Amino acid sequence: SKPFTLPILTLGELTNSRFPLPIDVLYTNPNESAIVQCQNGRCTLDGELQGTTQLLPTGICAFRGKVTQQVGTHWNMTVTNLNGTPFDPTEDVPAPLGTPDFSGQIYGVISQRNTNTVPGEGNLPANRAHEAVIATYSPKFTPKLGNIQFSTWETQDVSSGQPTKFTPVGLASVDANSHFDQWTLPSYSGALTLNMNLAPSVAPVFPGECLLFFRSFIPLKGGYGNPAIDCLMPQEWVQHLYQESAPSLSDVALVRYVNPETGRTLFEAKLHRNGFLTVARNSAGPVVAPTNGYFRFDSWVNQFYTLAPM
Amino acid sequence: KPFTLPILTLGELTNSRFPLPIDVLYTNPNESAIVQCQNGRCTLDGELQGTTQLLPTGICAFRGKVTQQVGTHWNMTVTNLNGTPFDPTEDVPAPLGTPDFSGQIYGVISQRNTNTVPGEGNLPANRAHEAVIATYSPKFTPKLGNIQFSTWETQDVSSGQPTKFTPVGLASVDANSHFDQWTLPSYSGALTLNMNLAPSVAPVFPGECLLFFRSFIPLKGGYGNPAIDCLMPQEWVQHLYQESAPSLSDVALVRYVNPETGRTLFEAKLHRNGFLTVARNSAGPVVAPTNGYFRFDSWVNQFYTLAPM
Numbered sequence: 330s331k332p333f334t335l336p337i338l339t340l341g342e343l344t345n346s347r348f349p350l351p352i353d354v355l356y357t358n359p360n361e362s363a364i365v366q367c368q369n370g371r372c373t374l375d376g377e378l379q380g381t382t383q384l385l386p387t388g389i390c391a392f393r394g395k396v397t398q399q400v401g402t403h404w405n406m407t408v409t410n411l412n413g414t415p416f417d418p419t420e421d422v423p424a425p426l427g428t429p430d431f432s433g434q435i436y437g438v439i440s441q442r443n444t445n446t447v448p449g450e451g452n453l454p455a456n457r458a459h460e461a462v463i464a465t466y467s468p469k470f471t472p473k474l475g476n477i478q479f480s481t482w483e484t485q486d487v488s489s490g491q492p493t494k495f496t497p498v499g500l501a502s503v504d505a506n507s508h509f510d511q512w513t514l515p516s517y518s519g520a521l522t523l524n525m526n527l528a529p530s531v532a533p534v535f536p537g538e539c540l541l542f543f544r545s546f547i548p549l550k551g552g553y554g555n556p557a558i559d560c561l562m563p564q565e566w567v568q569h570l571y572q573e574s575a576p577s578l579s580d581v582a583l584v585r586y587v588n589p590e591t592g593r594t595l596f597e598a599k600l601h602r603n604g605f606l607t608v609a610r611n612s613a614g615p616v617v618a619p620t621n622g623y624f625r626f627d628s629w630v631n632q633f634y635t636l637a638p639m
Numbered sequence: 640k641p642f643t644l645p646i647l648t649l650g651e652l653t654n655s656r657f658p659l660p661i662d663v664l665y666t667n668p669n670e671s672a673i674v675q676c677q678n679g680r681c682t683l684d685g686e687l688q689g690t691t692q693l694l695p696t697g698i699c700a701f702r703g704k705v706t707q708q709v710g711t712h713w714n715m716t717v718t719n720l721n722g723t724p725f726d727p728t729e730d731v732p733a734p735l736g737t738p739d740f741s742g743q744i745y746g747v748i749s750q751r752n753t754n755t756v757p758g759e760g761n762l763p764a765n766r767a768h769e770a771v772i773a774t775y776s777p778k779f780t781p782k783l784g785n786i787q788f789s790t791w792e793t794q795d796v797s798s799g800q801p802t803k804f805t806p807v808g809l810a811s812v813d814a815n816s817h818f819d820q821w822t823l824p825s826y827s828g829a830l831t832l833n834m835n836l837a838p839s840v841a842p843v844f845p846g847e848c849l850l851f852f853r854s855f856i857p858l859k860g861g862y863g864n865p866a867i868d869c870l871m872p873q874e875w876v877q878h879l880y881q882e883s884a885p886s887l888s889d890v891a892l893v894r895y896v897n898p899e900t901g902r903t904l905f906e907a908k909l910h911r912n913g914f915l916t917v918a919r920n921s922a923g924p925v926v927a928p929t930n931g932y933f934r935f936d937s938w939v940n941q942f943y944t945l946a947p948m
């Protein structure tokens with residue numbers, strides 16, 4: 330039986346699995362009323378990706394496809410799998426892997442490199458890129474059906490029928506009107522249709538315990554706010570667990586957040602089979618801990634184990 | 640502790656020199672330039688070199704603060720990516736993550752103010768705009784803690800506020816844009832020697848050439864199909880760093896294998912300093928099944944003769 334391990338990486342060496350951002354802090358929010366059911370950064374401890382999760386850091390909240398027509402200014406674009414193959418709505422996933430998993434106005438850059446080349450230009454293609462926003466709560470956001478819409482400030486310099494890439498950067502806004510809610514899933518097929526093939530919701534099932542998140546702060550195109558995105562495990566853990574494919578020997582692994590300098594355990598946590606952490610903590614907010622710290626697998630325990638309060 | 644490479648197809652790898660997926664394996668035997676990139680550099684026993692760091696989000700990124708205005712141009716002091724002051728006495732070429740090629744790098748500058756306003760709900764103000772960093776410019780001196788960027792925006796950039804550069808692609812590859820992926824920036828300006836560089840790499844055996852992981856990089860406008868070639872993908876850097884396996888010799892023999900058929904498609908030398916060579920004599924992509932990946936075979940020496948591709 331290949332033993333279970335986590336990579337040895339401080340918070341400053343980890344990245345968020347739900348948006349292309351570094352991890353900034355560990356965070357808890359015991360009194361959260363929302364169901365936590367994100368679809369990116371989902372991976373079982375034995376290395377099975379779930380939801381819309383894929384392995385590339387560059388694939389998180391990215392889209393690939395072709396603009397079909399103009400419809401600020403608005404544009405419709407077909408979306409393929411990120412590897413360029415046609416997305417097959419019959420595959421057992423919620424949406425193309427990499428699709429954003431939260432409601433909001435996602436701000437980024439749309440770029441295009443034409444397929445046709447010009448002989449006068451050494452047989453090279455024309456290009457354009459422009460800022461763009463994708464509203465994931467809109468009824469035109471239907472990645473599961475192979476089509477989404479984005480808007481631009483630019484009014485004309487976007488070409489139909491040409492290869493198109495969305496590179497995410499941040500959020501456009503977090504004002505009331507922008508519907509930013511990190512725990513509200515998009516309707517991947519539109520509002521009249523149920524989401525399918527989701528990774529399951531996660532929650533603590535032990536008194537005194539709460540979810541522990543890896544939190545990143547996300548840039549804003551304008552306006553006021555300090556929005557955050559919380560993931561259940563960083564992208565490097567997803568990648569590592571996928572590589573190792575270690576059998577889970579129980580439903581719950583005991584992990585310790587250790588200070589390598591002093592060799593001391595700062596706190597302990599449960600790492601659950603479906604790929605998320607809980608701690609025994611009675612407050613909300615960031616965890617204040619030495620920047621050299623990281624989680625180390627200790628042993629397999631079970632649902633009856635009582636964590637020492639942080 | 641036995642040496643390993645991660646098991647990842649090209650479609651599961653990313654470029655260590657720009658935040659892009661790997662598109663193809665590629666050779667260019669007749670390259671006249673010295674290959675001495677500073678990102679994606681890691682020895683086989685897991686020592687990062689040049690300006691290499693572990694975060695995919697850190698590649699060609701900058702953090703710091705705008706100081707003044709001067710297309711509109713802006714001066715920006717840069718810190719380490721973790722926010723701490725960059726110490727020019729540290730033994731690196733420049734802050735880790737700094738771009739390692741000449742060109743006009745296109746991306747977005749974003750800002751989140753330090754001060755908050757009660758009227759506005761005790762939340763800080765924000766702004767982001769397209770920006771371009773010309774790494775060949777005399778104003779590009781990251782080793783001295785200071786760079787310059789330009790924007791189409793003419794005014795909506797604030798001084799003295801935390802600033803982030805998120806790279807997206809190149810602004811142009813026409814002649815006046817000086818894109819040369821193998822020409823290093825002068826991290827302190829042209830009249831100064833770059834220091835603490837990861838070493839140049841080359842085949843030391845007749846009939847061999849470097850093998851690259853190639854990505855195509857987006858363009859803001861104009862014509863071109865520019866590419867960035869890295870010596871090893873970011874995932875290999877991350878994996879080698881984790882395992883810290885001793886290099887038993889100076890050259891590890893690796894085999895590109897088709898997992899379905901078990902067949903070896905070709906073999907390569909993975910050198911101690913962190914790069915591949917193959918026995919091949921033409922420029923262009925390597926044509927190989929999408930399920931293929933490199934697997935560590937054994938250790939050998941500089942004189943081992945590779946099966947021609």
Ligand SMILES: C[C@@H]1O[C@@H](O)[C@@H](O)[C@H](O)[C@@H]1O
Nearest residue numbers: 551552553764765766795
């Ligand atoms: C509060 C304001 O928000 C947006 O309009 C920004 O572009 C401004 O610079 C300012 O930060």
Ligand SMILES: C[C@@H]1O[C@@H](O)[C@@H](O)[C@H](O)[C@@H]1O
Nearest residue numbers: 455456457486860861862
């Ligand atoms: C060849 C041209 O290059 C730039 O001017 C782009 O903005 C145009 O859309 C076109 O691609």
